[model samples]
Target: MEDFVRQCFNPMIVELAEKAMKEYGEDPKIETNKFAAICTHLEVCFMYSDGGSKHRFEIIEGRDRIMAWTVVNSICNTTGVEKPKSLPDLYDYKENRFIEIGVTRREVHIYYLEKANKIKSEKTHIHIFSFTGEEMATKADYTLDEESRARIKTRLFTIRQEMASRSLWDSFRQSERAA
Candidate 1:
């Protein structure tokens, strides 16, 4: 395990993990979770590289996809590595050395990047979702006055509820299959 860790864990990923853990606190779970999230993002990027259809969520209006891209972009920026221009094109070309080290890209401009720092969580990150809609709306050039923000928030709330219900049903179906 130590040999594999030494061999597989690149210095950049270790650095990114350290940075995230330091910001989020010195929890072992933070280290493990950051590593897992980075790996998962890389795996997904690679899987969609070879003419494979990208996941639907990649195109959906949601927070996770954006955050995934943000982390990829952040890591790439911090590590001085380049990423694919677009999410779908990440694995399109020959194996780029940066991709080899898992520094893929998911540029988070437009809406979320404008006030990203305001979305940080002191504890569990579930709260980020709560503000994702307003951040997105702000990116869309909507006025941040109370009325406009309220309207945008309500619309996003509806969309989220529907998605949550579908996700619950999907989970239930998978459980039944296992049973």
Candidate 2:
């Protein structure tokens, strides 16, 4: 067990555990019930890489996803938070990576300039995000307002709920058995 810890898994699980412990401090169950939540979140890398930047993107999307997932989970688990049963086709797959959930209007933007979108500098090819409805803010025109923040918070909470209810680990194990 110690060898396994030193060889692999510890470095990976520790960071994720810390985030779960900190974000869901109010409910110790999240940390205690690690099997399901951790397993679920791990399935999705929730992160991308960029070679143009001096430093690779770290916790760029993972951290936000966890925070969003935790809060969203709590709201849904405790207060019947709705997980937009019908998500708008707001995502533009070709142009960029972004998705905006309905009602509260929370938006999540993901962008990367890797070997695929190879470019000299990410300055012009960077991804942009906006929670505000006024002007779909981007790398060029953007503004952070209170309303946008609120929407983001709501969306994050929704993400948490999805994570809490998922059992990605069990699914994988079951698939292995089936195979």
Model 2 earns a TM-score of 0.25
47-86 in candidate 2: lDDT tens per residue? Answer: 1222113232222233456565554444346544343222
Q: Name the best candidate (by TM-score).
A: 2
Runs in model 2 with CA error above 4 Å? 1-13, 26-31, 39-43, 46-59, 64-95, 99-179
What are the models' TM-scores? Answer: 0.22, 0.25
lDDT of 1 by residue, 94-136 (tens): 2212221121112124223322333332110110112124332
Cα RMSD, each candidate: 16.3, 17.4
Off by over 4 Å in 1: 1-6, 28-34, 39-179
Q: Clashing pairs in model 2?
A: 68-156, 69-159, 69-160, 70-160, 71-157, 72-157, 72-158, 72-161, 73-160, 73-161
C-alpha lDDT score of every prediction, in listed order: 0.33, 0.33
Tell me model 1's lDDT, rounded to 2 decimals: 0.33
